[PDB]
Amino acid sequence: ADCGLRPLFEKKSLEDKTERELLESY
Amino acid sequence: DFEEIPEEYLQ
Amino acid sequence: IVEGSDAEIGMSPWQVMLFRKSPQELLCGASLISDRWVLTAAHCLLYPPWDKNFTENDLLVRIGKHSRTRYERNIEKISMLEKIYIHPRYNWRENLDRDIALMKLKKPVAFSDYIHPVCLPDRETAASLLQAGYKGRVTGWGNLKEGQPSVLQVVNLPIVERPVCKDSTRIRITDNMFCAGYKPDEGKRGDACEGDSGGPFVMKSPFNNRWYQMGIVSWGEGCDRDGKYGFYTHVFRLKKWIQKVIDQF
Ligand SMILES: N[C@H](Cc1ccccc1)C(=O)N1CCC[C@H]1C(=O)NCCNc1ccncc1
């Protein structure tokens, strides 16, 4: 139910260094 | 190469 | 992972290391899908042509890791297995069709900054995201070249059209597989490799910003060869089996 939301990124509204490449491909 | 883990686990 | 980068701390908190007790060696990757269940490739546990057939007591799962070889005190958790479940129709004889296995942990792991489950896709997440051109992300501690990293590696790769996947190999491809990788002309590289097996191919939903595991690192011919692609177990196609195992046991 909390699946797929990372404590150190999504939960803090921080992005990792390449996740934009993923989202720019969709 | 691999660092030894606590033997508690290898039991 | 070939042509990947060092992961950030906490970047893949579902990443699991399958770890052999003796000799103490990394077996495979895997993923945490609840506090008690780990998803991996069946060939990590069972592959008769190579005389591979591991059982529960052969194995430890290590969760929360970043460094490949260090025992990461106060950060990782090491769990024992209660039960391994291999797909009843996993095809090790021919093409690794239905390359999937569940492992029930002997006790539930506690989540933390470094340990957190990934989602499994529903039908409409799969339909929406599993498209040629869309990129997913593969992680692992496997080989850097067809040598081993100090730290979890990460690479992002596009899904490849099904006919391109078929025309790249002599192996019979099924609907329970997809392939990912850059074409030779695309001028970007990267691939899973030996030791990455069983690890997660994940995508981030643009609708709810959650990470979903779409694939399991299954097989390839070489690592990062031009005109060759990585093949992954299609997790959604086999989710009915997953659901079945989990709420039966
Ligand atoms: N090289 C074989 C290619 C029934 C491929 C299906 C059947 C026979 C060869 C392979 O990858 N195999 C042989 C059986 C296990 C698997 C493996 O080593 N997988 C490791 C993952 N390797 C990758 C390399 C590059 N890209 C993705 C995965």
End-to-end CA distance of chain C: 34
Distance CA C184, CA C218 (A): 21
Q: How far is CA C23 from CA B7, C49, C141, in A?
A: 14, 21, 17
Dihedral sign for Cα A15, C152, C81, C98, please. positive
| Among C1, C6, C8, the residue to mutate for chain A (most A Cβ within 10 A) | C8
Strands (E), C126-176: 135-140, 153-158
CA C244 → CA C68, C126, C236, C238, C248, distances in Å? 33, 19, 13, 10, 6
- Experimental approach: X-ray
Q: Give CA–CA dist C98/C137, Å, rounded.
A: 21
User: Which residue ranges make up each domain of chain A?
Assistant: 1-26
Q: Please work out whether the CB of residue C233 comes within 6 Å of at least one atom of ligand 1.
A: no
What class does CATH assign to C1-12+118-236? mainly beta
3-state secondary structure C31-94: EECCCCEEEECHHHCEEHHHCEECCHHHEEEEECCCECCCCCCCCCEEEEEEEEEECCCCECCC
Range list for CATH 2.40.10.10 in chain C = 1-12+118-236, 13-117+237-248
Which of C122, C143, C141, C133 lies closest to C214 in space, CA to CA?
C122
CATH number for the domain running over C13-117+237-248: 2.40.10.10
Residue C133, number of CB atoms within 10 A of its CB = 10
Residues A10, A15: Cα–Cα separation, whole Å:
7
DSSP strand pairing (C25-32 vs C77-86) = unpaired
β-pair partners for C233: C177, C216
Output Rg (C-alpha) for chain C, integer angstroms.
17
Residue B7 CB coordination number (10 Å):
7
CATH architecture of A1-26: Irregular (4.10)
**Which residues in chain C touch residue A8, judged by CB atoms under 8 angstroms apart?**
9-11, 13, 113
Can you give the three-state secondary structure of C164-210, one letter per residue? Answer: HHHCCCCCCCCCCEEEECCCHHHCCCCECCCCCCCCEEEEECCCCCC
Using CA positions, which residue lies closest to atom 13 of ligand 1?
C219
Best mutation site among C44, C178, C189, C219 for ligand 1 pocket (most ligand atoms within 8 Å of CB): C219
Question: Chain C residues with CB-CB distance to B under 8 A?
Answer: 21-22, 24-26, 60, 69-71, 78, 80, 148
- The contacts of residue C163 (CB under 8 Å, 6+ apart) are none
Deposited resolution, Å? 1.8
- Give A13's contacts in chain C (Cβ within 8 Å): none
3-state secondary structure of C30: strand
Ligand 1: does its nearest atom lie under 6 Å from the Cβ of C95?
yes
Contact status, residue C201 vs residue C232, Cβ threshold 8 Å: yes
